[PDB]
Amino acid sequence: GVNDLWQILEPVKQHIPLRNLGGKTIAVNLSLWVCEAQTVKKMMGSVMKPHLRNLFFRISYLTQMDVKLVFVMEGEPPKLQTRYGSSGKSWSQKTGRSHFKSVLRECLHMLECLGIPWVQAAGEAEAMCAYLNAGGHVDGCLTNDGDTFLYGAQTVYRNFTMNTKDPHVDCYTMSSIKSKLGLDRDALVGLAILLGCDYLPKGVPGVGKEQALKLIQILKGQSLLQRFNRWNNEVENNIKKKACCCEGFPFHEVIQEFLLNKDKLVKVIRYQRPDLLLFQRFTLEKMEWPNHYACEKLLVLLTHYDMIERKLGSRNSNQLQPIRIVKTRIRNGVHCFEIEWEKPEHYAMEDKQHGEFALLTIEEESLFEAAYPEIVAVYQKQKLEIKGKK
DNA sequence: GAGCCTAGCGTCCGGAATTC
DNA sequence: ACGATGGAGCCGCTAGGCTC
DNA sequence: GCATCCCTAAGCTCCATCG
DNA sequence: AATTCCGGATTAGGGATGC
Ligand SMILES: [Mg+2]
Numbered sequence: 001g002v003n004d005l006w007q008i009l010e011p012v013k014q015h016i017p018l019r020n021l022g023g024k025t026i027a028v029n030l031s032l033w034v035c036e037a038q039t040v041k042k043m044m045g046s047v048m049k050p051h052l053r054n055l056f057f058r059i060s061y062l063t064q065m066d067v068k069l070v071f072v073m074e075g076e077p078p079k080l081q082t083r084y085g086s087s088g089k090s091w092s093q094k095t096g097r098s099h100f101k102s103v104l105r106e107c108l109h110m111l112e113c114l115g116i117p118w119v120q121a122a123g124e125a126e127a128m129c130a131y132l133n134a135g136g137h138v139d140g141c142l143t144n145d146g147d148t149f150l151y152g153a154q155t156v157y158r159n160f161t162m163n164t165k166d167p168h169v170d171c172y173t174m175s176s177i178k179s180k181l182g183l184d185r186d187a188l189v190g191l192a193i194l195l196g197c198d199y200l201p202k203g204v205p206g207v208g209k210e211q212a213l214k215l216i217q218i219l220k221g222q223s224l225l226q227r228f229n230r231w232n233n234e235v236e237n238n239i240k241k242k243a244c245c246c247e248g249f250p251f252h253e254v255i256q257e258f259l260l261n262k263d264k265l266v267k268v269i270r271y272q273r274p275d276l277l278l279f280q281r282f283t284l285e286k287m288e289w290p291n292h293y294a295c296e297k298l299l300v301l302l303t304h305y306d307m308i309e310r311k312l313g314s315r316n317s318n319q320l321q322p323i324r325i326v327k328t329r330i331r332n333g334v335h336c337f338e339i340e341w342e343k344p345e346h347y348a349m350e351d352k353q354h355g356e357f358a359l360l361t362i363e364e365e366s367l368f369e370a371a372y373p374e375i376v377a378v379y380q381k382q383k384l385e386i387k388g389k390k
Numbered sequence: 391g392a393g394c395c396t397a398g399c400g401t402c403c404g405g406a407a408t409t410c
Numbered sequence: 411a412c413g414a415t416g417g418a419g420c421c422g423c424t425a426g427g428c429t430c
Numbered sequence: 431g432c433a434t435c436c437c438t439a440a441g442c443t444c445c446a447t448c449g
Numbered sequence: 450a451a452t453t454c455c456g457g458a459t460t461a462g463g464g465a466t467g468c
Contacts (some may be wrong), residue, residue, distance in 0.1 A: 017410095036391075046429080050391065053393085165425095396425100396427090401439085408453100410453075410454095413448100414448085415446105418446105421441080422442100433468070
């Protein structure tokens, strides 16, 4: 968490709407989402836990945008005693941390119900995100604020929001940082050194406004030049650097903390079909969702998963079967079909007599045609029949 | 933060401020 | 017959107030 | 009978009642 | 300097009132 680093990286950031993330895989810092949900203050009298709710609806929206996800489960930080409130040990602090971990466990449970993979990070989640990105396992890393670039990530997405107007993420690519700003990974690390990180809150003595001028000065290397100083215009910025030298270079250990990679993968990242029964059970006992409501909310994820599998070329009997195409529709400028489906196993209906009429979705024409070309074919046949009739 | 539920709009064109 | 003017319902989008 | 002045709507799509 | 707005302008109807 460098002070003012995002401001430094602002000229490179690009406003990217969420729909434009289709076909991309993103690692998600689950902890940041859970804390963000904890920050909600509106529902004072009825503060139902929005950690699970926001997680689910974000997952649903991104899934409908053809965005696959893998969630990173935070581990233990490597480094942390003033015998005050400042020390993390305290009943309210400890028990609160236990509650946070419990919420994380529940979120993991819902991820398993949805069939979405989650990995285990050794330490900070950001490190595992950058590990997935650098390893080609994901296309981007989603974080409101973090040192993901310092852990070696190439692409970072920021400021996620689902506002009806302007759903977007601010994108930061490493290549455009090295080209437009001329900042390599080591340059970012050293910038985090003089400006301070989540480990070091101090931005002083270096003002930081002239550190960019130092980066303009030297083009070859960054950290090595901080190294020769231990053996030790230019004299003046080096004088402020001397004000940093009286500190004694305690941040070297932080450097090697950023550069060392401890994260590993135990199992291949895999996606499974959402479990309708397990999802009804979980949402019922954890969020007090009626079974019919949980089914109604999960239907779009079931249809999306099955359509994806059929497009991949694998078809099984357990997949959902469309009864018919009702009519063509348009959703946010996208051409879609209104699909009436057949009632799947363990699906709960609100209306006893008409629930089977109620089973309905709206799917993108492209993906639905890839999944059920026969259904699309008979619909287009009926359209040829109406145009031929008149 | 996101969803749910309700309401109401729905023309063309050009100067305008400064890219939802 | 005919088809034409209705007209009521619906559709897609946006906004506001309240709920989970 | 026709003119004047002001206000308001302005999407699409079936069916249906009417000349 | 360029691409979103919104304020004014269109066109057509309807109603109340005036010649
Ligand atoms: Mg973390």
